[PDB]
Amino acid sequence: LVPRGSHMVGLIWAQATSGVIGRGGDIPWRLPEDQAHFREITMGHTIVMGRRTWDSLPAKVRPLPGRRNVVLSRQADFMASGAEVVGSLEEALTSPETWVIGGGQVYALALPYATRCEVTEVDIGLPREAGDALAPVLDETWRGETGEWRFSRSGLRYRLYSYHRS
């Protein structure tokens, strides 16, 4: 349960088994089960994303519905129609429950404040290339639950992890 006076911070991402989450301004796969899972977890809460993740969303779909959208940027002239742009995590983490939805830079930025991670891992062989966005690495203060491999309608294995710390 989340007390309304708290500030719970979770990270949610999908990665290949290599840890790649992003390449060329996009996610280098599509997985409907992951899209459904992402929506189930985040709906009704504030979502925080880096400016490059906002850019990766088609204009027609953003801001993502049913959630307060907040975008992190250091550029004083970057604007996100329908959403709030702020310059720091201190400004972005004011709701009782916030999901940080990417990308690589913002996961690393938010990790010190996070107590939950929800991961989808896709069994697609995409080794790391220069310039890729990568999942954050989780140290021994975290404890994880790893689901068994499941099989998507699109013919990829995937599995879910849930990590927590105090």
Cis peptide before 112 (omega within 30 of 0): no
Backbone phi, psi, residue 7, to 5°: -135, 80
Site for ligand HVR in 99-118 (CB under 6 A): 101-102
The answer to whether 133 and 113 have CB atoms below 8 angstroms apart is no
Which residue(s) pair with 99 in the sheet? 10, 47
**Does 63 engage in binding with ligand NAP (CB under 6 A)?**
no
Q: Per the annotation, does 52 bind a ligand?
A: yes
**DSSP category for residue 26:** B
Q: Which does 34 bind (CB under 5 to 8 A by kind): ligand NAP, ligand HVR, Cl ion, none?
A: ligand HVR
The residue among 95 and 120 lying less far from ligand HVR, judged by its C-beta, is: 120
Piece of the chain touching ligand NAP by CB under 6 A; list 40-48, 49-57, 62-70, 149-157: 49-57
Rounded to whole angstroms, the Cα distance separating 121 from 22 reads 13
Measure the CA–CA gap between 107 and 50, rounded to whole angstroms. 9
Q: Is residue 14 involved in binding ligand HVR (CB under 6 A)?
A: yes
Kindly tell me the sign of the dihedral angle through the C-alpha atoms of 92, 90, 117, 108: positive
Exactly one of 10, 16, 19, 38 binds ligand HVR (CB under 6 A); that residue is 38
- Which chain residues interact with ligand NAP by CB under 6 A? 13-14, 21-23, 25-27, 50-53, 56, 72-75, 78, 87-88, 101-106, 109, 133
Binding residues for NADP(+): 13-14, 21-26, 50-53, 72-75, 87, 101-106
